[PDB]
Design a protein around this nucleic acid. Structure first.
Ligand SMILES: [Mg+2]
Ligand SMILES: [Mg+2]
Lengths: 181, 116, 66, 78
RNA sequence: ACACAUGCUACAAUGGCCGGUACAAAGGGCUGCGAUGCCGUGAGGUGGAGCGAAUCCUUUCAAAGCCGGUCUCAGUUCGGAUCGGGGUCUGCAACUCGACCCCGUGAAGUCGGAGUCGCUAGUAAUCGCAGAUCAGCAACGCUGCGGUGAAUACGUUCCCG
């Protein structure tokens, strides 16, 4: 297994499919997955400074990396905050680990959601970059059902080299992304 | 365990554990077990994958899923409220639909005992 | 990547009741994951069931028969 | 249980509608024919002398007058 | 959108569910009761031996009561209301216009403050049976019945008559 399953199949099948669907007229112009940024949506800070460790541990065993925390970029008055408090932890997967996480997700997590209907393809920005979110918690089978105390969803954004939302949609369709129209 | 989207109790009989589903209860689970050929005195810690799958497909074939029943109740309620009938008026006003006492009773539907 | 700030990473095989076999790196040391759902979406039929369950006119018809 | 005011016309209309199994509104003309068990939830557009409103009959509605779901004597006060 | 009065349901293990079991008095019946059977989770669709009065339901009579299995003392197999789907008894007509059954839905209630009610032996308590009128019931109410059936009774200083 020199390359992950997703990388191996994308090297030929998805590449040829995209080249046949959109005539780029030159190699190196085919859209490809650049990175996958997964962020743990938090903000309960200023009332409990312990759940951040649980969020970090959840990001762990879900991504094969050590998530880092992003501190408050500005103190807000309405919402209890403070400049320098750790608000949210993210991981930036890229390469073999990125492909592994992507395929494991597409294979286990998405079909594991309760009352799963699919994913909307309209969640595409103006640069062919996809973004979605896991709602409550425990979509992957790496975390025990009882080892979790409270639900802590996350937001996953796949940044690819798709100059157009249509190109990104085609790339994800060639991939194992279930979409509903 | 994971059956249709809900988790069952830890240490309980099957006929009481299957009550967690929005479309299965004591007698419904008893009938399902009698039709599938499974005992009811078994605990909720010795289940098999084959039995899980067979029960899932049996309930999906005979009855419908918990989410199906939930959104069906929601759709029927909103439809009978939109048609503009007595049931819809009572549902909009937070009053009983079956036409019972409303002078002092009906708190179960009107919410907590409020006085203004 | 650093020395040991991450947990173990080993290959694991995932099975299903329908015989679907998957293989991918994960944290499970057992290397075997018996799951009730894999890349074969029963939601595909669960959604059509959610939709077909609708219909109040048919319920009126049947339970009236009056 | 003797012969009620079944409105033989509406009765036979409902019978043929049940036979052909075509879900469509049936334009009625009476207002006191909800007795015979042969009416399998056949949606009657009733004529209250003004217009025809489509209202589907329900289980608790079995027995009540045809044009009695909404107040036939239109009056609110405000 | 609320307040007062009287009753039922309970709030859990002297408990809940399932299977097997014994005695009570009281009758509602003529356009009413209606046992055996067919089929039904169940109201019940078929219906007739028998009745101006023991051949027939209310059984050759019930519940609390006794035996076995299970729940492991918790918002739960306690409690059952609102609500949605599948039906039934009456009469031509049951959401405003009764009751009952099956499935799911599973809220308050953890024995209750200020105040206050009933009970002196077959009494309280607890359990059901039956009836007054209705073709159809709001009937948990009002009357009678009995099953099992307790503790106190210095005394009239003291609240009311
Ligand atoms: Mg599956
Ligand atoms: Mg408790």
């Amino acid at each position: 297994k020199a390359l992950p399953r997703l990388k191996q199949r994308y090297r030929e099948e998805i590449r040829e499919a995209l080249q046949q669907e959109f005539n780029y007229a030159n190699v190196m112009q085919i859209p490809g997955v650049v990175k996958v940024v997964v962020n743990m949506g938090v903000g309960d800070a200023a009332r409990d400074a312990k759940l951040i460790n649980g969020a970090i541990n959840d990001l762990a065993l879900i991504t094969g990396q050590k998530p880092e925390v992003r501190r408050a970029r500005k103190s807000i008055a309405q919402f209890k905050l403070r400049e320098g408090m750790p608000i949210g932890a993210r991981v930036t997967l890229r390469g073999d680990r990125m492909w592994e996480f992507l395929d494991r997700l597409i294979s286990i997590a998405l079909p594991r959601i309760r009352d799963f209907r699919g994913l909307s393809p309209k969640q595409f920005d103006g640069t062919g970059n996809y973004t979605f979110g896991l709602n409550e918690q425990s979509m992957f089978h790496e975390i025990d059902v009882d080892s979790i105390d409270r639900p802590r969803g996350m937001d996953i954004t796949v940044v690819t080299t798709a100059t157009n939302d249509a190109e990104g949609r085609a790339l994800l369709r060639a991939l194992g992304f279930p979409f509903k129209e | 365990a994971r059956l249709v989207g809900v988790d069952l109790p830890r240490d309980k009989r099957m006929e009481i554990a299957l009550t967690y589903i929005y479309g299965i209860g004591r007698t419904r689970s008893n009938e399902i077990l009698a039709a599938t050929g499974i005992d009811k005195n078994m605990r909720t810690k010795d289940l098999t994958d084959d039995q899980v799958t067979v029960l899932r497909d049996y309930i999906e074939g005979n009855l419908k899923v918990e989410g199906d029943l939930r959104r069906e109740v929601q759709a029927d309620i909103r439809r009978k409220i939109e048609i503009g009938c007595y049931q819809g008026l009572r549902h909009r006003r937070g009053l009983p639909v079956r036409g019972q006492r409303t002078k002092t009773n009906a708190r179960t539907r009107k919410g907590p005992k409020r006085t203004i | 990547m650093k020395t040991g700030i991450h947990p173990e990473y080993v290959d694991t095989t995932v099975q299903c009741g329908c015989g679907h076999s998957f293989t991918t790196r994960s944290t499970k040391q057992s290397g075997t994951i018996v799951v009730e759902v894999c890349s074969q979406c029963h939601p595909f039929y669960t959604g059509k069931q959610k939709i077909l369950d609708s219909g109040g006119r048919v319920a009126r018809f049947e339970k009236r028969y009056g | 249980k003797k012969g009620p005011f079944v409105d033989d016309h509406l009765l036979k209309k409902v019978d043929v509608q049940n036979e052909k199994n075509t879900k469509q509104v049936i334009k009625t003309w009476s207002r006191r024919s909800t007795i015979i068990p042969d009416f399998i939830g056949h949606t009657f557009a009733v004529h209250d002398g003004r217009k025809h409103v489509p209202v589907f009959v329900t289980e608790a509605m079995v027995g009540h007058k045809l044009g009695e779901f909404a107040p036939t004597r239109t009056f609110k006060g405000h």
